[PDB]
């Protein structure tokens, strides 16, 4: 099958900047290739065709061009309906195939999270498991370093990740880590800390808890 | 128009046929495709089929179980889904060489095996102590271990929307969905307001209501 390596996996931009994303083919294609739009929660939308045919109704803003290997989609004057995600598909033989994606958002001014950690409730713990939550709040850009810390201890493997939305409001992400025991691992440690870095603080933030004393 | 139908919970190994009634063009003279798009990864084509049902063509990931056909007097496009693995969880949309809006198919049976839908435990998420210094504080509902997607999460019957987060769910290694709300709220109001997350899960007719406070 032929591998569309798309650049970048994201990309922050401001209303009306001029933007560049990039497909890179394991093989000659032709003009075999095109270009979609997805936002979230809905299907697919074709912007190019043929390289650099546009699609009737698509604003004249969106452009492509491209050889038979590197194919580019130019966005010029960026307007705010333009923040989604983008695909690259070639059609030249089977099996067609897209790109990895570009989730293009909206760059905005350096904000710091408020970082928080909840302990596990009792309720929780009777049924054998326990959730340590810590929490990110409103912070920009999206790029964080979440560590646990259990007695010190670092912590792997043991934890998810989930991330919201960009808010439509202040631009900012949200995110939060759980890390998951059982109840007889959790009750035979004592300290459970979470460490953040970010861009915005100017040393990493440490929330922590003390079993017995919570 | 496209509209995609037959999608919904199933279980591994067992089988599941989707339909794409087609409207508004000549069906008969366009080949159709079937794509589909796993949670938080990009598009995948699946299947096409030419436009008089002669020349079909697969993925590899699905050769020898999914099965393209058409019938172009019904102006209906089939997808046959056979020994389906978890990895084959997407939303599925054809598209005329128009998109439809897509069908979601999730493979797993997750939950138990004689009642794959499973309501939510709801914790609560509060500090251990009200912190001083810091004028904003943070509450929660941990919403977890459902089948299947989705649940919603409203505070204090709607009347608290400011400021609330409730994360996209993630897939455990159990099968069962998980999530969290979180809602920043004044650490002057810590311990004297109510703050009440309430949880629909409405494919196990699930209503929950549950207060967070410290004990």
Redesign the interface.
Known sequence: ?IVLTQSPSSLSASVGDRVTITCRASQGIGDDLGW?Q?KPG????LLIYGTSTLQSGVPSRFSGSGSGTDFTLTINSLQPEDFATY?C?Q?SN????????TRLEIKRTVAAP?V?????????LK?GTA?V?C?L?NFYPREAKVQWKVDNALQSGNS?????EQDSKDSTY?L?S?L?LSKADYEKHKVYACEVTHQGLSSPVTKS??RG?? | QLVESGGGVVQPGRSLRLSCAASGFTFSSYGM?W?RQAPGK????VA?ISYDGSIK????SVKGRFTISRDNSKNTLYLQMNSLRAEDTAVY?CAR?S????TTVTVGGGGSSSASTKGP?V???????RSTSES???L?C?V?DYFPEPVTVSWNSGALTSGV?T????L?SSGLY???S?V?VPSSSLGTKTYTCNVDHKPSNTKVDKRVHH?
């Open positions: 099958e979609y997805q809905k299907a697919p939308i695909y598909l059609d089977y099996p067609l195939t897209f790109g990895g994606g408020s928080f950690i909840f302990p596990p409730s009792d309720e929780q049924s959730s939550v929490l709040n998810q990740e989930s991330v919201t949200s939060s759980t998951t808890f003390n004393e919570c | 495709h794509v990009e598009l995948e084509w096409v063509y697969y993925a590899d949309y060489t998109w439809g809006q897509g435990s914790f609560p998420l509060a500090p251990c102590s904003t504080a943070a929660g941990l977890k987060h994360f996209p769910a993630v455990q998980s999530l969290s979180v920043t004990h």
